Design a binder for this molecule. Structure first.
Ligand SMILES: O=C(O)C1=NO[C@H]2CN[C@H](C(=O)O)[C@@H]12
Ligand SMILES: O=C(O)C1=NO[C@H]2CN[C@H](C(=O)O)[C@@H]12
Ligand SMILES: [Li+]
Ligand SMILES: [Li+]
Lengths: 263, 263
């Protein structure tokens, strides 16, 4: 049939997609900025489609409710036919891969530790061997799952603590985790993806730090409905853009050129 | 039809696949050891197949001859029907993705610099601004292509030098590049994947070093013939093994537990 505008679903997560400060004055795709806004433009160019950016209606990434079996978030919008492509920091996982198609990674990352500067923690082992400093993860996401699935003693000890800690150590969003680190006076550490951690470390008030190495190695992928004809071209575009350096150019633009914490 | 033993193609590249020292005394899959030997066993277990490891007949990874348009190496064995799956450090690239199916990455990596210890080079920029120390890449591979495709001034300067340097700065294999670093008295530096670089740094005679950060971010994938029914299960197995920590366990086993250069 005739071509139609492609509906892109994405999520407000800095610096991937942000409302421009003057968005009330703008319309359409021009309302948004960030790494994934720039990536969407490049993918559309390299696949030859016109597109409309939309923010996922429920504000969520995508998980399946254990009781109703309904997918929420961006994954749900793809699964149920409400969007054509998701361009966001959507971690490639087994459970999602079974229901949607993913490009090869456009960004690589791993689980990492965020502290308020001066917190006496250098490693996951340090967290696991003390109790004064609480620590947790995003409540719905791949970081929590790493701990749930681990057979490594340190990470098992961490999961046993986190899963039962009161008050809850799990947070609703990255912004909530960061705020909790910043406001808990060194008594909360946040486990999150290295990409977000490294971004926040270069944001005012410049009071957080990434500590230690990454605990694993994963990727973000562009997602399409399973079997969608768009997936092949999107995947080729990701590889081509990576090979020509464009993805690293965008990362440097949004993480470091725009850093607020010095050079 | 009835199930058949799956033919796995792989390549002798340390520590991914190596002949055991006593291989003359062994038969079948037991002749080989390494990260990809262990990974093949896990993939076969998690997909429910029996398999035979084979070493690619021509000893090559996979590139297309510009004149005959014939694919060589492991990619060729898949394309032309001589093997069912390739389990090796095969970098996921646009040109290969067009002709074979790739799992999501089982290992993440980037281009890196190897020096003989004491060479006065800390970065790619350092290499690009001098001439006494020659430098190059594997003659057929993704590292060379990064330089060919770059628009970054430093990397463009490096490519302009490498492509015309005499004698050739390009090497046949990783082992040749390492030997050239080790034997050139500080006057050759080798650009190679971080995975190989980090392995060699922990091998006797402990005379090489990785310097600087990685220049890009890429992945190794398990490859199957395009459209092969095996690809779906293989990809799920990679994600599942990553999520449960097995891939990192194997990396640590083969890179660092077995390191020869101290603790
Ligand atoms: O689990 C985490 O640490 C996460 N942080 O941000 C979200 C984006 N990637 C993960 C996902 O896709 O589930 C989520
Ligand atoms: O290009 C390089 O630096 C490479 N080193 O080892 C080879 C394995 N991965 C790359 C490929 O698949 O072409 C090759
Ligand atoms: Li999928
Ligand atoms: Li492919």
């Amino acid at each position: 049939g005739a071509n139609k505008t492609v509906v892109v679903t994405t999520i407000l997560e800095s610096p991937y997609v942000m409302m421009k400060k003057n968005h009330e004055m703008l319309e359409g795709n021009e309302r948004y900025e960030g790494y994934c806004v720039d990536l969407a433009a490049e993918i559309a160019k390299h696949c030859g489609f016109k597109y409309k950016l939309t923010i996922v209606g429920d504000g969520k990434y995508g998980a399946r409710d254990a009781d109703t079996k309904i997918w929420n978030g961006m994954v749900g919008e793809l699964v149920y036919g409400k969007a054509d492509i998701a361009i966001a920091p959507l971690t490639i996982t087994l459970v999602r891969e079974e229901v949607i198609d993913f490009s090869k990674p456009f960004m690589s990352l791993g689980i990492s530790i965020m502290i308020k500067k001066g917190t006496p923690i250098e490693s996951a082992e340090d967290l696991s061997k003390q109790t004064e400093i609480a620590y947790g993860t995003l409540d719905s996401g791949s970081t929590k799952e790493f701990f749930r699935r681990s057979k490594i003693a340190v990470f098992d000890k961490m999961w046993t603590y986190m899963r039962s800690a009161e008050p809850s150590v799990f947070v609703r969003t990255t912004a909530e985790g960061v705020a909790r680190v910043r406001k808990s006076k060194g008594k909360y550490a946040y486990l999150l993806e290295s990409t977000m951690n490294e971004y926040i470390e270069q944001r005012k008030p410049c009071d957080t730090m990434k500590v230690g190495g990454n605990l694993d190695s994963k990727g973000y992928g562009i997602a399409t409905p399973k079997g969608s004809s768009l997936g092949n071209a999107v995947n080729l575009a990701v590889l081509k853009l990576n090979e020509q350096g464009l993805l690293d150019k965008l990362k440097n633009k949004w993480w470091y050129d725009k850093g607020e914490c010095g050079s």
